[model samples]
Target: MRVQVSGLSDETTWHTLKDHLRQAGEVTFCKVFSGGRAVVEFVTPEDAARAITELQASELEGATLFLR
Candidate 1:
């Protein structure tokens, strides 16, 4: 499943999100956009949902998360 994560900017933010998702399971891919957003591909929708629930905006480097 493809989960959209908004309010991201750099590699640090990407890694923060990546690590959070990793706690649930393996992430297929994590791509950070220059436009301040990211797309994370997970193995399942449930994992994606878990990621959204666990991660918070303050945990990252000026990045907020929104599942889409």
Candidate 2:
């Protein structure tokens, strides 16, 4: 499963967001772009959804998390 996080810089904010999501499950890969967008691939879609719901999108440092 894959989830995309938007509205974040590729700097510290993006790293923080990735770390936060990593706590939810195994983060296979994460890529942050200069355009303030990131894509994270999780172990499963269920895990992605769970991360979004449990994380509440509030724990993120500077990005909105959405499951895709």
Candidate 3:
């Protein structure tokens, strides 16, 4: 399952985001892009959905997360 993460600030990194997202479930892949956006892939759809519900609007360091 894939989820798009946005609203990341300069304080956030792919590794940081990956670690945080791992709380919901296993992350198959996570990549942070140039435009303060991230793409995340979880082991299952349940994981992705859970991440969205749990992590949405959550703050990480200096960034606020938005997931879909």
lDDT tens per residue, model 3, 1-68 = 88999998877888888888888888988888977898989999999889988888988877778998
Question: CA lDDT of 18 in candidate 1?
Answer: 84
TM-scores for candidates 1 onward, in order: 0.67, 0.66, 0.90
Q: In lDDT terms, how accurate is model 2?
A: 0.68
**Colliding pairs, model 1:** none
lDDT of 1 by residue, 12-39 (tens): 5567778766876678899877766778
Provide C-alpha RMSD values for all models, in order: 2.5, 2.7, 1.0
- TM-score winner between candidates 1 and 3: 3
Per model, state how many residue pairs clash. 0, 0, 0
Q: List the global CA lDDT of all models.
A: 0.71, 0.68, 0.87
In model 1, the Cα lDDT at residue 49 comes to 76
What local lDDT does model 3 show for residue 15? 83
TM-score of 1: 0.67
The digit string of per-residue lDDT tens for model 2 on 37-59 reads: 77888888777877777765443
- Model 1 lowest lDDT segment of ten: 56-65
